[PDB]
Structures are given as structure tokens and as C-alpha cells.
């Protein structure tokens, strides 16, 4: 049956038994970190003929070759690689061949059979019967193929029953084991598949098959596998899934079925039965099944734990990277100050609303709010003790808010307070005013002439500090 997704059995070689179904595993296979006792015998899954992604064996001792586990894994489709590798052998004690001796296609990504000391029986494969892009192998720490030794079926007594090839300028014989050949078919079938009697398979046969020229007797798909037929693509009303099988509508929107997600759910959008919409796709509802354009940067609400955001740098800001609406507290407080200011916009520019307020207090680094270059609503549904939905204190360089002329922006509920801001002349404050629609729910000492803009060329006044905002 088909098992899936990637199964990742490690730590207790008994764990292998849950793989005893699987003829086909849809996802990928890990064998971590696993040691076989040579007395406890051995098991072996004959049913698994295929891999849907990439199988990945890593320090695993006591297993002695491939083929006793999986003697029959015919096809490794590769349709997602463990960086570029679509079988890699790392670390793997007492291996002395790979013996994966019926597999005759990997239809994607490359081979990495690093450090196995005593594997043998690898420079007598020829990987390009199996695989395209042979030249992608990564090969290196394995047996030295003269202390190997290895010989072909027949070899010793005298009657090669293997096929040579030639590899590096080496023309010799290719077998997985003493006593297996490596399987190749009548140059006849051409790009086809073959029988154990070399009689070509059917195009659409992938790997190899039952009998010829049928394609409901392939061990694999070359394409898409449908109703107990190889398809070269999938019948109406039927779509791709997981690259090598069409699957209709209620069977896509059953696949959560035994679980209780809160998220959105699969959907099914150019022919294909994906969990999630494309890139610059959005469901067009809330768990619709159909993916619909965005129009722009799609839609992102952020939220976090804390309902306020306190950005003391440009790496804290990281998370508001992509977000349309951030439901929550901004509090701005960049002191250090290098050049944070194209860098912050990088972040923060795409933000159109936030939902609480905006506190901008200490922040020595900056000269303006213009890398806040979406923000058009803040909708003041949390505001500061006093009401105060934009609270600017403590401001050192800040020259201006945003370009009153340029740009729009609202407060929806709340007011402002602007204090000891010595380069922003109030003239600005005042324009924001005007835009934001704050103007008349101020106080007084909120917009104060005595320590904003106090040092800025212009064009409870004439003090630094007063009574008036010790309030
Ligand atoms: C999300 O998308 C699905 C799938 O719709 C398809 O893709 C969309 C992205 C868009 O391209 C669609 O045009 C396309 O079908 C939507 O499902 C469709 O939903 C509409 C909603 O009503 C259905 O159409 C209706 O069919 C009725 C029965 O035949 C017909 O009576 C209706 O006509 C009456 O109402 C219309 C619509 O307002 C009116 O203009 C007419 O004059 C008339 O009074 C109406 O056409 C489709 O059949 C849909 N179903 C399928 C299976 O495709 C889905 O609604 C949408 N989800 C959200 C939240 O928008
Ligand atoms: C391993 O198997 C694939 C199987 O081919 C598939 O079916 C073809 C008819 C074609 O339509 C492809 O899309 C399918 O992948 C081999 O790769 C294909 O090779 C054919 C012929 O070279 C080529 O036209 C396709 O583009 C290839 N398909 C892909 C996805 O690349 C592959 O060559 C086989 N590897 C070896 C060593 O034989
Ligand atoms: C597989 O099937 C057998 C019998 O149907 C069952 O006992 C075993 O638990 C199953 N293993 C898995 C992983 O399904
Ligand atoms: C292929 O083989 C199966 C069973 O042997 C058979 O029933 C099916 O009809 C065959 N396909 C063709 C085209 O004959």
C-alpha cells in the first residue's frame, strides 16, 4: 500500500516493521542512527517498489546490504531531493554492497555514497543506465576497489553472465553483487522498459513490468499512476498528487480528514491537489478550494505572543518582514543608528495597518518614520494611559514623520503626544494632525512648543522642560 509522508525509522532497528505494507512510500524514507545485532536475524520488505522523493541511509551498522532490506525497490522518483540527492548512503558500518539489485531508475536528483569503509560492489554499477545526471554523483571514502576484489556472476568460474559497459575508459562487466547482474534491456525496446525476458514494457511503464506491451502491468509509472493504469497524464476531474498520481476532488478535500486543523485546508489549483495555494496566490474564502491572484504582496496578518512589538534594532524587525496588518503594539526604540533606514523598510515598509498604537520613544538612529512607507491606518483599539493612540518621546534626530504631501495615514480612535524632540518642528506635528484626523481630540501639553523643535530651524514655550510634562 502506499505509506506516507516521509517515514523517518531510527534509533530501534525494530522499527523497520513499519514498513511492512508499503508497496509505495509517498514521501521520503530515513534509516538513521540504527545498529543491527548480528545475532538477532534479519527482515526484508519485497513489497516496496517505490519511493516518491529520496531514500537516505545515515550511520547505521549491522545492515550489510541494501537489497536484503529492499530487494525489489524498483523506482526513487526523486520528486523532492535531499539536497540534490535522491539517494544518499552516509556512514553505514559493515555495508559491503549496496545490492539494491532490481533498481533501474531514479528520475531525479543525484547519488551521495560517502565514507562506508567496506562497500564494495560500487565501482561495478553503472549509474547511468539508472540515472541522467551521473555527473552530479558525489562518491568518496568508500572501499578501495582492489582490496574489494569484486567479481561479477561468473567471473570465477568462466561464463560472465553479466553485460560490460564502459566506464572512465573502462570497459568491464556491471552487477550489484557476486551474484547479481545489473539488469539492462534489449536495445530493441530503445527508451522502454523490459521484462525479465527483456520484452518491452509499455512507454508509459516505468522501471520495469509484468508483462509486455501492457500498461496495467508496470511496476512503476513513467508519469502519472490512475485506477490501476500508468497515465501519461491524469483524466478529467482527476488531479496531480505528489507528483505520481491523480486523485479526484473529495478524496483532496478528505486528506485532513482524520485530523482536527485549524488551518486551511488543501486546495486544488492548476490541476493540481496541493496543501497550500501557490506563491502569490490566496484561497479566494476562507478554506475554499480554489486559489485565487493576490493583486500585490498577498495578505499577511502578524501576531505575536506579547501584544507589543518593542523593534530595538533591525534584526528585532525580521518577523514584520512580509506582513500587511500587525495586530498588536509597535514601540520603536532604535538607538544605535548606522544607516537603519532602508534596512528597516526591507521589513517594516509593507505594513498598511496596525491595530493597536504607535509608540516612538528613543530612538536616536532616526531622522524620519518613512520607512514605515505602507502605513496608511492605525486603529487605535489599544492606546496608552491617556488615550494616546501615536506617542513620539525622547526622539533626538527625528526630523520628520512621513511626507505630509506625499503620504496619507488615519488614526482611527485615540490622540497623540509628541515631547523632547529637539528637530521636529511642530510644524510637522501640526500637518499630521490635519491628515491623521487627530485634529481637535488633543490636549494641550500634547503638542508642546517648549522641548519640540526646539533646536530646528522653523518658520510653556520659551522653557526646556516644565510642570507641564511632568503630567
Ligand atoms: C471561490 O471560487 C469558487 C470556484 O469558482 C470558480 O473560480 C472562482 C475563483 C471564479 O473564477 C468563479 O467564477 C469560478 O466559478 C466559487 O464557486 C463558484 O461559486 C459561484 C457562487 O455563486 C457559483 O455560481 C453560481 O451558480 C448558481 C447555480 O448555477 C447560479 O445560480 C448563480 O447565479 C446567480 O448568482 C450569480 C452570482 O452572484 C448572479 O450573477 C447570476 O445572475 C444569478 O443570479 C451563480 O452563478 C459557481 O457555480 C461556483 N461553484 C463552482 C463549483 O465552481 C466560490 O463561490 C468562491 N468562494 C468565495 C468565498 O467567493
Ligand atoms: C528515468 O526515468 C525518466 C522517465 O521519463 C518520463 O517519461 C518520459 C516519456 C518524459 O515525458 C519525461 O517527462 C518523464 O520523466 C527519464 O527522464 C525522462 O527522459 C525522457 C527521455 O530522455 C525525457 O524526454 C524526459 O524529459 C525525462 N523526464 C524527466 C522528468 O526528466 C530518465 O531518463 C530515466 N533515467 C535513465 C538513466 O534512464
Ligand atoms: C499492516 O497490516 C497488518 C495486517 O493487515 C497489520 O497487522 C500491521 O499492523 C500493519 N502495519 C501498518 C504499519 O499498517
Ligand atoms: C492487459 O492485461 C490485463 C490483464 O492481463 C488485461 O485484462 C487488459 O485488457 C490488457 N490490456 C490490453 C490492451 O489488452
Avoid at 550489510?64 to 548512503?89: C, M, Q
Wanted: proline share 4%; hydrophobic share 30%.
Amino acid at each position: 500500500e502506499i505509506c506516507g509522508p516521509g517515514i523517518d525509522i531510527r534509533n530501534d532497528y525494530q522499527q523497520l516493521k513499519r514498513l511492512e505494507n508499503c508497496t509505495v512510500i509517498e514521501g521520503y524514507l530515513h534509516i538513521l542512527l540504527i545498529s543491527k545485532a548480528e545475532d538477532y536475524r534479519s527482515y526484508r520488505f519485497p513489497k516496496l517498489t517505490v519511493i516518491t522523493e529520496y531514500l537516505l541511509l545515515f550511520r547505521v551498522a549491522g545492515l550489510e546490504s541494501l537489497g536484503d532490506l529492499f530487494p525489489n525497490l524498483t523506482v526513487i522518483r526523486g520528486w523532492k531531493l535531499f539536497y540534490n540527492y535522491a539517494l544518499v548512503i552516509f556512514e553505514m558500518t559493515n555495508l559491503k554492497d549496496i545490492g539494491l539489485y532490481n533498481l533501474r531508475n531514479i528520475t531525479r536528483g543525484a547519488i551521495r555514497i560517502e565514507k562506508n569503509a567496506d562497500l564494495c560492489y560500487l565501482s561495478t554499477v553503472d549509474w547511468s543506465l539508472i540515472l541522467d545526471a551521473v555527473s552530479n554523483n558525489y562518491i568518496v571514502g568508500n572501499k578501495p576497489p582492489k582490496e574489494c576484489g569484486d567479481l561479477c556472476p561468473g567471473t570465477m568460474e568462466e561464463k560472465p553472465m553479466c553485460e560490460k559497459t564502459t566506464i572512465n575508459n573502462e570497459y568491464n562487466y556491471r552487477c550489484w553483487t557476486t551474484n547479481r547482474c545489473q539488469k539492462m534491456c534489449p536495445s530493441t525496446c530503445g527508451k522502454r522498459a523490459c521484462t525479465e525476458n527483456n520484452e518491452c514494457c509499455h512507454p508509459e511503464c516505468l522501471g520495469s513490468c509484468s508483462a509486455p506491451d501492457n500498461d496495467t502491468a508496470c511496476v512503476a509509472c513513467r508519469h502519472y499512476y490512475y485506477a490501476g493504469v500508468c497515465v501519461p497524464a491524469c483524466p478529467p476531474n482527476t488531479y496531480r498528487f505528489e507528483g505520481w498520481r491523480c486523485v479526484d476532488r473529495d478524496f483532496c478535500a478528505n486528506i485532513l480528514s482524520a485530523e482536527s486543523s485549524d488551518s486551511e485546508g488543501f486546495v486544488i489549483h492548476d490541476g493540481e491537489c496541493m496543501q497550500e495555494c501557490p506563491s502569490g496566490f490566496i484561497r479566494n474564502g476562507s478554506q475554499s478550494m480554489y486559489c485565487i491572484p493576490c493583486e500585490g504582496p498577498c495578505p499577511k496578518v502578524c501576531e505575536e505572543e506579547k501584544k507589543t512589538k518593542t523593534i530595538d534594532s533591525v534584526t528585532s524587525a525580521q518577523m514584520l518582514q512580509g506582513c500587511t496588518i500587525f495586530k498588536g503594539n509597535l514601540l520603536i526604540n532604535i538607538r544605535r543608528g548606522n544607516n537603519i533606514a532602508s534596512e528597516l523598510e526591507n521589513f517594516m515598509g509593507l505594513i498598511e495597518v496596525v491595530t493597536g498604537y504607535v509608540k516612538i520613544r528613543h530612538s536616536h538612529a532616526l531622522v524620519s518614520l518613512s520607512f514605515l512607507k505602507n502605513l496608511r491606518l492605525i486603529l487605535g483599539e489599544e492606546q496608552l494611559e491617556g488615550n494616546y493612540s501615536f506617542y513620539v518621546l525622547d526622539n533626538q534626530n527625528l526630523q520628520q514623520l512621513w511626507d505630509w504631501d506625499h503620504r496619507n495615514l488615519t488614526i482611527k480612535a485615540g490622540k497623540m503626544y509628541f515631547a523632547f524632540n529637539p528637530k521636529l518642528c511642530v510644524s510637522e506635528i501640526y500637518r499630521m494632525e490635519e491628515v491623521t484626523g487627530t485634529k481637535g481630540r488633543q490636549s494641550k501639553g500634547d503638542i508642546n512648543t517648549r522641548n519640540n523643535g526646539e533646536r530646528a530651524s522653523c518658520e510653556k514655550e520659551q522653557k526646556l522642560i516644565s510642570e507641564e510634562d511632568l503630567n
